[PDB]
């Protein structure tokens, strides 16, 4: 928190939208089989 309090969303989108929506949607396909 601070004013805006827009870090903390700004750091969600970066660890949950992005460690699985890198190689985990449009990738593994062609690696788990």
Same mark, same amino acid.
């Given at each position: 928190?601070? !004013?805006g309090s827009f870090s !903390?969303?700004?750091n969600t989108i970066? !660890?949950?939208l992005a460690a699985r929506d890198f190689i985990n949607?449009?990738?593994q396909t062609?690696?788990?089989d």
């Open positions: 928190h601070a !004013d !903390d969303e700004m970066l !660890d949950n949607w449009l990738i062609k690696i788990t």
